[PDB]
Symmetry: C5
Subunit: 258 residues, 5 copies
């Protein structure tokens, strides 16, 4: 039960940070990239390596202790993808688009996703191929059945660990997440162009239809993201996912609850 | 029905929340959510699709708490479930070029949902009136060449799962007064899927008189199609790929005469 | 006419609901909704399309209850009927690559509709003024080279079905005071059809003075074109494919002097 | 000094007309097309022929003789003949074996303006060493700076079939007494997207509630509607343009 | 800075109007507005771009009427426009024919369109596609790069305080700073991406923040920044060059008292 907002100078606070992408980081020079993608011979034999799998990013940000029951209420978000212009590097071991041409820029399938919540993002598992063998060191839908290719309600989890939950197996659970606001776009196809807007003049309001934002349990704010921008194609044609960091600025206020 | 006032009080509202699985054809025990690979007849006359190559409309009839009062559907939140699964470009796909990743799901899509107080009303329209639709499907009967544009004989209710093929039926715009429907067809073999997800978006189901669908016999009807595109295998064979759809509907008690 | 007050009361409103079938050329008894395969002239000057290769504007004139009072058209709901039929990619199509599904309908599209209290007024514009338009169609006569850009002699009324070729005529923006019209041409050979359906969208037909089309002689005129794109067969021959359009119009009685 | 609007029966008027495109008109049969486009052998030798260069269209429309001035308040406009681009049977290049002709497509520029005096132009050159042909009005004394901004290149759109589209844009440092709108969509496979309706009005009033004030009782209308390129059987490409409809409502306004 | 009332009166508003020229690299005396042709390194380690192959941010510091009570000029509105959009219709100047007998391939592919108005220099954060890229002499670039610089390294902070210097590909606006600037940009990537460029003199952007305050011009200087890489020009032989265009700015300012 939600009561009144506290006012006064001490009543507001602000969280500011960035979440780095977790694309797989196949070697010490390739932070922000995945391993080159290879294709299994069959559905049965799909067995991606961990460094080939982009994962959800998450940060748990402690807020000023509030231990009347008060909670921090997240009200507004400003967010931005950081380093969008890095994708103009078309002179770095890329594949020429045509004889004597510049390198093929990063493109193809993208997923841009962010959420703000008063607890961990709740996830539902959905598998493209239920017979995929997910690698050690990732957290993936377990006891998969063919029904996992459409909906298996056993696959419930919390986004509670960084570089662990592969993007391709998990989505926000729309049956839960009442105390989180999430937003995402998947743009598919191998040739889709990245379209990335930046400005410091856009704010998202996080209040629901009753004027209540995410309420931070135990004084923690949960920020989550995925920004798979597309694939980089190298000179020999191997393709790697490329990700970028996401900025978050969230304003919170103190709210009394019963 | 003459529509009178809304009931208030804590008992006066209820909520339905569920998901509808897609019915893309399910050609074997490992391929739920996919169709059979798509083949092409040599002529219009010989068009004879397998049942498991034809995606169908999904429908769920949701019983509501027993109630002259009727449940009125006011708001919908909906969402395609599992959008990220289409990032699996490593599973038996066709490389886009030498050493490349697999071609992702792409091509013709149909995304559709409806909320109604009775079954969705369908009108039959055939691409090719001589198509032979297979046993187990419910399809436009006594088809003529006029069925390729409009034959008013082809009326039906979406009253059964895995039955009504997507390609030969649409919502009947001459009926459906007690239903709200929304759909988009995006055609072309290279169309990129564009799938948005959020829990912050609500659709209001009220018509221009402030009246939502009224649930006859205390049943709410949900229907959906989410054909996302085609998956292309190593050999170039293509299968429709679908995803489940979440519905959350809020309803209120309304008195009627 | 001075336009005076709207009449109220039970008798004072009416509704029209119908569908217009597309007129794409209909080359044989099995191919309603399709044009003949398109062939290309050997030279610019020898362009001579056959009648069954030329999509035409559709038009219906709808009698209203007999009534100075005039029926005033206030709102429109409209929808393309049978959007899902374009998922038939298994019927005499051209494979998009080896073992692939059929190339779906795509390419140049024109979706157009109008509602008026008299016939839609047309202005003729020709791609090529030396085109020989075929007998049985109504086309810009006495064409000159100016007809490729603007020849004000080419005026007509859309007063006949299966007659006015889409490629020759557009709504005349210098006239049509008593009609509301809306169209989109999307050109290019691979453009993807994007077709939205819903029963929740209404267009208001009133002008800036709050006045809708006034139906002369108690007739309402509906017009449409819905060339969705081209179908490509196995051998690569291409034909226009069209679909029917639904109209629901609400009208009220208006007094006039 | 703008004062009040005059009301009453006599105080409004309306202009209605069509501007034809000026695409180059390479022969007596080819009104609305350019000459087939050829490509120079090098950058320094770029020398387009006149009939290969689309130009800005302009009409100066006399208004009822009137201190009062006609003030332009609203505009309805659209491209005339959009359906003509469905002719894919007229000696085009087949998209594939047995296919229909390739439709008009590729780079487009759609532009219109309404002003109480001639549109003011600023010159910018893709390649300052382009020799523009006799019979066109082009930026003079071009330098390498003309490729980005050379403020010497100022002109008025005061003549039809004369100012090449590729050389000139509206001058954003001027045109206080004009409203202009344009979109360039570039790329050889760009599909035309053309909307028509008689239900859309553009308001021409500025933030102070004042529209273009017509000097000398003349209204200036300008347009470009390069819809794309038509590809002939043999691969040669010509710009194709279409006419634009204008309807402008004007009201009498007192001025000091 | 405690922001107080706006001054009114005839002498209390002013206007700045100008154009920023693009800085694409200018590889020779005939190629203002173009980059050098793009070449591709065989490894990430060996990426060493020449200066004239690297587009850079444009910046102008515009002196305002002197105000030295403390008054500061406050930027309130912006009109802006890319100048010369129609130049991209030159498909006849030694381009690569799209097909036999066809016109020249128009400028297309990756674009970045960006503008900012601030009361002090735009603040930048460095991000690198490839941390081992060696940026050339005469450019100002992220120093002491590490592999973390490919995603976020907070050491890479700078001010856009010099023209023809800050390469577009390694710097973005720093979202943790820029309180006294309003910035807007769009990256559209992909080699076949069609330029879509709108021009009009009827559009205005309001520069006021959620509290009604616009950029306050420190030292009576207005900072304008821009990038307008429109795509690439492909010549006959297939070599590709970036092509940019100038940007118009008209900014209205008012006098604002501060404590
Ligand atoms: C009947 C036919 O299309 N024949 C082809 C020849 O045209 C072609 O030889 C080229 O012809 C050129 C001039 O002819 C055209 C053209 O550019 O192709 C013919 C077009 O139909 C015509 N288009 C229109 C709308 O009128 C076009 C136009 O008038 C001008 O381009 C205006 O600039 O002219 C020219 O002489 C070339 O040098 C010549 O190669 C041959 C070989 O490609 O194939 C024939 O089948």
């Amino acid at each position: 039960e939600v009561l009144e907002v506290k006012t006064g100078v001490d009543s507001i606070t602000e969280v500011e940070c960035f979440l780095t992408p977790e694309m797989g980081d196949p070697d010490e020079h390739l932070r922000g990239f995945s391993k080159s993608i290879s294709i299994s011979d069959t559905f049965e034999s799909d067995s991606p390596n961990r460094d080939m799998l982009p994962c959800y990013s998450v940060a748990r940000i402690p807020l000023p202790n509030l231990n009347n029951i008060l909670m921090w209420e997240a009200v507004t978000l400003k967010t931005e993808v950081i380093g969008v212009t890095s994708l103009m590097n078309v002179h770095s071991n890329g594949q020429a688009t045509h004889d004597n041409g510049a390198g093929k820029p990063v493109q193809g399938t993208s997923f841009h996703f962010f959420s703000v919540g008063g607890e961990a993002l709740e996830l539902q598992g959905v598998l493209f191929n239920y017979r995929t063998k997910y690698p050690d060191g990732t957290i993936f839908p377990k006891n998969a059945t063919v029904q996992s290719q459409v909906m298996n309600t056993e696959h419930k989890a919390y986004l509670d660990k960084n570089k662990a939950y592969p993007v391709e197996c998990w989505v926000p659970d729309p049956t839960r997440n009442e105390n989180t606001r999430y937003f995402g776009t998947l743009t598919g196809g191998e040739n889709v162009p990245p379209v990335l807007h930046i400005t410091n003049t856009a704010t998202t309001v996080l209040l629901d239809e009753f004027g209540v934002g995410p309420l931070c349990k135990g004084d923690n704010l949960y920020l989550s993201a995925v920004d798979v921008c597309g694939m980089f194609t190298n000179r020999s044609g191997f393709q790697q996912w490329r990700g970028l960091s996401r900025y978050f600025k969230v304003q919170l206020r103190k709210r009394r609850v019963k």
